[PDB]
Amino acid sequence: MELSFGARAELPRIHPVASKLLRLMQKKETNLCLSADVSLARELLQLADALGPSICMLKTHVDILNDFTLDVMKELITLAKCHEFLIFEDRKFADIGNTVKKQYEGGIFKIASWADLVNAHVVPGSGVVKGLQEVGLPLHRGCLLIAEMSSTGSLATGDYTRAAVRMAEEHSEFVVGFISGSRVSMKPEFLHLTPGVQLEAGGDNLGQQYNSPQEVIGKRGSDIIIVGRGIISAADRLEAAEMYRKAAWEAYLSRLG
Amino acid sequence: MELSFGARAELPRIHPVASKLLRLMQKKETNLCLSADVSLARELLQLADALGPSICMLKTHVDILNDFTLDVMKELITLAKCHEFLIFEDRKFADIGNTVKKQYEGGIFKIASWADLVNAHVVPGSGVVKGLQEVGLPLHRGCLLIAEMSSTGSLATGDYTRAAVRMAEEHSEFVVGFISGSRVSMKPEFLHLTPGVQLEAGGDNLGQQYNSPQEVIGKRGSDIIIVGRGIISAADRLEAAEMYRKAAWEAYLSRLG
Ligand SMILES: O=c1cc(O)n([C@@H]2O[C@H](COP(=O)(O)O)[C@@H](O)[C@H]2O)c(=O)[nH]1
Numbered sequence: 165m166e167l168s169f170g171a172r173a174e175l176p177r178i179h180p181v182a183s184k185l186l187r188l189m190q191k192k193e194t195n196l197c198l199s200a201d202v203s204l205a206r207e208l209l210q211l212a213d214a215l216g217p218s219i220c221m222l223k224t225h226v227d228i229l230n231d232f233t234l235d236v237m238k239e240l241i242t243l244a245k246c247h248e249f250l251i252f253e254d255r256k257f258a259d260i261g262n263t264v265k266k267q268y269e270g271g272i273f274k275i276a277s278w279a280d281l282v283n284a285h286v287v288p289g290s291g292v293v294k295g296l297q298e299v300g301l302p303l304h305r306g307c308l309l310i311a312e313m314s315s316t317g318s319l320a321t322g323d324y325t326r327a328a329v330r331m332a333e334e335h336s337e338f339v340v341g342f343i344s345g346s347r348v349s350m351k352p353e354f355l356h357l358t359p360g361v362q363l364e365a366g367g368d369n370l371g372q373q374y375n376s377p378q379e380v381i382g383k384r385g386s387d388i389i390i391v392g393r394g395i396i397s398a399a400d401r402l403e404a405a406e407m408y409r410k411a412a413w414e415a416y417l418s419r420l421g
Numbered sequence: 422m423e424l425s426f427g428a429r430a431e432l433p434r435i436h437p438v439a440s441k442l443l444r445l446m447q448k449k450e451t452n453l454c455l456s457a458d459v460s461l462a463r464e465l466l467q468l469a470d471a472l473g474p475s476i477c478m479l480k481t482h483v484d485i486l487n488d489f490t491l492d493v494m495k496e497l498i499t500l501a502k503c504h505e506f507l508i509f510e511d512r513k514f515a516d517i518g519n520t521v522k523k524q525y526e527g528g529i530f531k532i533a534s535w536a537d538l539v540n541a542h543v544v545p546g547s548g549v550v551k552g553l554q555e556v557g558l559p560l561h562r563g564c565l566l567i568a569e570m571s572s573t574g575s576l577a578t579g580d581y582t583r584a585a586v587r588m589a590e591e592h593s594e595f596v597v598g599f600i601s602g603s604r605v606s607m608k609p610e611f612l613h614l615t616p617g618v619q620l621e622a623g624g625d626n627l628g629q630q631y632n633s634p635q636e637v638i639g640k641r642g643s644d645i646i647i648v649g650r651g652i653i654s655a656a657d658r659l660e661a662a663e664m665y666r667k668a669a670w671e672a673y674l675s676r677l678g
Pocket residue numbers: 199201225254312313314315343359360361372390391392393394516517520
């Protein structure tokens with residue numbers, strides 16, 4: 165009784181950030197998250213502008229931006245609103261609750277002020293979520309839990325993955341889904357986002373492993389593909405994004421029947 | 422056949438950063454790491470100056486410093502050299518190798534340029550270490566692996582902890598020890614640093630749990646205590662640091678016999 169993204173956006177227990185996302189995914193016919201893994205603000209912004217219409221989400225690693233300022237993030241928000249995508253800061257909070265609350269709100273980055281979504285590892289126990297929530301709930305943000313990883317030797321398997329799912333389902337006022345390689349929850353209110361995606365077989369030199377959009381979305385039942393180098397390293401990043409968008413979208417449609 | 426810190430500093434397989442640390446621990450009679458969990462540079466630096474003689478290490482969370490600049494870190498290095506302690510940036514790298522390499526070297530923080538030590542979660546698999554190593558080995562840095570956590574519901578137990586130990590022992594050119602609640606490796610070349618430490622019983626509201634220096638160092642066989650609030654929240658932070666230093670040092674001596 166699989167529901168479309170648009171119908172999932174209306175589920176009783178849907179989080180507002182999840183709903184906004186699902187609605188724009190349906191509107192734009194995209195379930196592609198760009199992993200904007202660049203070190204220059206101008207490149208980040210030029211990618212966001214050009215690729216904005218093709219993506220549901222732009223994932224950042226703010227801590228690799230050589231020329232980060234809060235003004236850069238203002239500009240990114242303008243593009244996100246214009247083109248209709250969410251901003252996901254891929255910070256992988258992974259500390260005790262008291263620490264992560266400060267890392268989310270404060271410092272130079274002020275992540276909570278501009279990021280629609282963040283994520284967290286579940287290794288510390290649920291305090292990591294509780295700490296983040298203290299900041300994120302008042303700011304109407306959402307969080308993704310890392311239930312599985314794409315890299316060689318990942319320990320996010322078995323009972324670890326199950327613990328992630330339980331933690332999400334117990335903190336559904338804030339947690340909107342997962343970073344995972346497959347569908348890990350049977351509850352349609354939760355988003356599944358899958359990195360480690362390229363059209364061609366392969367990996368990198370540092371433990372990354374790739375699977376295709378058809379595999380991830382079609383066979384493994386995930387919702388969204390997260391793609392970095394498969395787009396960013398291409399000559400024509402717009403065409404690359406469109407190829408990935410079309411692949412992910414068709415895989416979704418076909419699964420829906 | 423337990424060895425003193427000074428003797429461990431000379432072990433054939435010791436890492437140079439571990440050796441430097443162990444030597445200054447023995448010289449200064451301190452196995453206390455201050456967790457300098459403050460948001461103001463002036464406070465960070467005033468603590469580093471006053472408490473420097475009492476500590477073997479100062480642990481930072483750079484990403485909570487409201488007024489971070491690289492010049493602040495220059496000033497911290499000056500104090501570290503004057504008073505003889507290492508700087509440990511508690512970044513908890515926890516991504517694929519290709520990402521962490523950039524997060525360690527680059528961005529605004531340029532962590533590798535000033536931090537003697539960093540740490541990593543083992544959840545991604547060994548690529549996290551391999552990526553960090555690409556930056557850290559040329560810069561003569563060291564890394565600690567998070568084998569156990571102090572917080573309620575921690576998943577860093579059992580086979581996860583064992584995996585951390587194996588990963589360390591397989592990357593001994595870069596990995597110098599662990600963040601853990603107890604001795605997890607039988608190899609004396611590896612450092613054990615233990616957070617979740619206060620003199621009094623208790624915890625916090627967000628999953629932290631405390632054990633005493635005598636428990637951690639004496640009974641559980643760790644090397645170094647990491648103390649935040651037990652010092653930072655006290656009126657007289659110098660006296661507090663001295664209490665913690667004396668507690669940890671005596672526990673070590675007694676275990677040594
Ligand atoms: O399991 C995971 C979780 C991630 O967030 N990521 C992230 O997704 C992106 C993958 O990038 P790429 O497509 O270039 O391999 C990176 O930013 C990485 O940090 C991942 O690769 N695997």
